[PDB]
């Protein structure tokens, strides 16, 4: 697998792992999902301290359309924590493509144990992937977990 690859030319899909992000057009990706926007230097430091940042971009002159996110400790662990796909190009399978890439990279770079928090709705999605949740009864658990209005998974 390596770093930039066309998905799809109906306009081209490109697929990248490089983690060329400008954070202006990830803030306008994450508008049309609905996210309170952060500090645009801090949506930088996340990005730049992200191991894994992958992209699709449509190119006719490219248009950010999705993004995974993935932190790690470059050994043994990795938690993706944001999946987006643009709302105009849900329903054609561009997240579910975008992940099948993302776990490859991964493990490509010789990492184990690949996790995520999936809130509800998308369970189902990423056990079709395989994905299983609460291995051994193992739990997701967070600190004083603040009400979620926004989610971080749309395929």
């Given at each position: 697998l390596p770093e930039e690859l066309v998905l799809?030319?109906?306009e081209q899909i490109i697929f990248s792992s490089?983690?060329?992000?400008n954070v202006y057009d990830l803030q306008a990706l994450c508008d049309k999902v609905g996210w309170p926007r952060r500090p645009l230097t801090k949506i930088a430091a996340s990005l730049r301290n992200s191991y894994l940042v992958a992209t699709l971009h449509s190119v006719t002159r490219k248009q950010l359309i999705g993004m995974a996110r993935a932190t790690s400790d470059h050994a043994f662990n990795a938690t993706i924590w944001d999946v987006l796909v643009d709302p105009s190009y849900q329903g054609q399978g561009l997240g579910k493509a975008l992940m099948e890439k993302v776990i490859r990279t991964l493990l490509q770079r010789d990492i184990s144990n690949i996790t995520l928090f999936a809130d509800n709705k998308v369970v189902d999605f990423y056990k079709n992937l395989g994905f299983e949740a609460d291995?051994?009864?193992?739990k997701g658990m967070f600190w004083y977990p603040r009400f979620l209005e926004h989610h971080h998974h749309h395929h």
């Open positions: 799809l030319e109906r490089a983690g060329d992000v291995p051994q009864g193992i």
